[PDB]
């Protein structure tokens, strides 16, 4: 059974803070064809090699895909503590991982280009004593997902939700898409327990 890669090929790709996670188990994967479906720009793997990513069978294959420009790749680098890591996505390095950048050619009309790129700059709990910043857990989601779900229209737009003892604020920055759409994948392979059935085609 070929692994279903249709969801990333259909519809508008999600933003980084609302990344789409798909878990593949017990299927045959051909990541080379998917890479050929895009214009690959960057490929950096930690605790694993790209040759050892195409080959080798894994218990589980988790793909966290989102829309991401190439210019902000350096901000996703491990160790750098910035807005992306603090409030959008912290890559989990407990297991071997791969960060893959790509570029969708204009001929691929099955994917709709969003108006802009959106990432969270602030997500904090506000009392009267100041600000208490909430930081993302490694691999988890942001606490401001429900509030940010409404979306952002302009640059640095803020959403506020009242709490029992203060409020919760989230902020979004907006930059428009110019050129062929670029999108990023975080691929994590699990060796732990359940059958190395995620095998190459």
């Amino acid at each position: 059974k070929e692994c279903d890669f249709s969801p990333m090929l259909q519809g508008t790709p999600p933003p980084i803070y609302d990344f789409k996670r798909l878990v593949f188990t017990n299927c045959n994967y051909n990541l080379t064809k998917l890479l050929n479906l895009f214009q690959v720009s960057e490929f950096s793997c930690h605790q694993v090699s790209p040759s050892s990513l195409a080959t080798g069978c894994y218990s589980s294959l988790t793909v966290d895909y989102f829309a991401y420009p190439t210019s902000m790749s350096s901000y996703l680098q491990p160790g750098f503590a910035g807005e992306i890591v603090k409030f959008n996505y912290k890559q989990d390095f407990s297991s071997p991982t791969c960060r893959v950048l790509a570029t969708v050619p204009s001929n691929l009309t099955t994917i709709t280009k969003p108006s802009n790129y959106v990432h969270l700059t602030e997500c904090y709990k506000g009392t009267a004593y100041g600000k208490n910043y909430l930081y993302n857990a490694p691999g988890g989601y942001t606490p401001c997902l429900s509030l940010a779900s409404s979306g952002f229209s302009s640059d640095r737009q803020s959403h506020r939700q009242q709490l029992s003892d203060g409020y919760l604020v989230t902020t979004g920055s907006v930059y428009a898409v110019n050129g062929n759409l670029q999108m990023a994948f975080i691929i994590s392979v699990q060796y732990g327990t359940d059958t190395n059935s995620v095998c190459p085609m």
Binding site: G126, T127, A128, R156, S158, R160, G166, Y167, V169
Partner: peptide, 18 residues
């Protein structure tokens, strides 16, 4: 005073930025 400051902080933060 705490609630007044809580309202004022958000209103001022959203109005001074513009």
């Amino acid at each position: 005073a705490k609630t007044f400051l809580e309202k004022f902080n958000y209103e001022a933060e959203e109005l001074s930025y513009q």
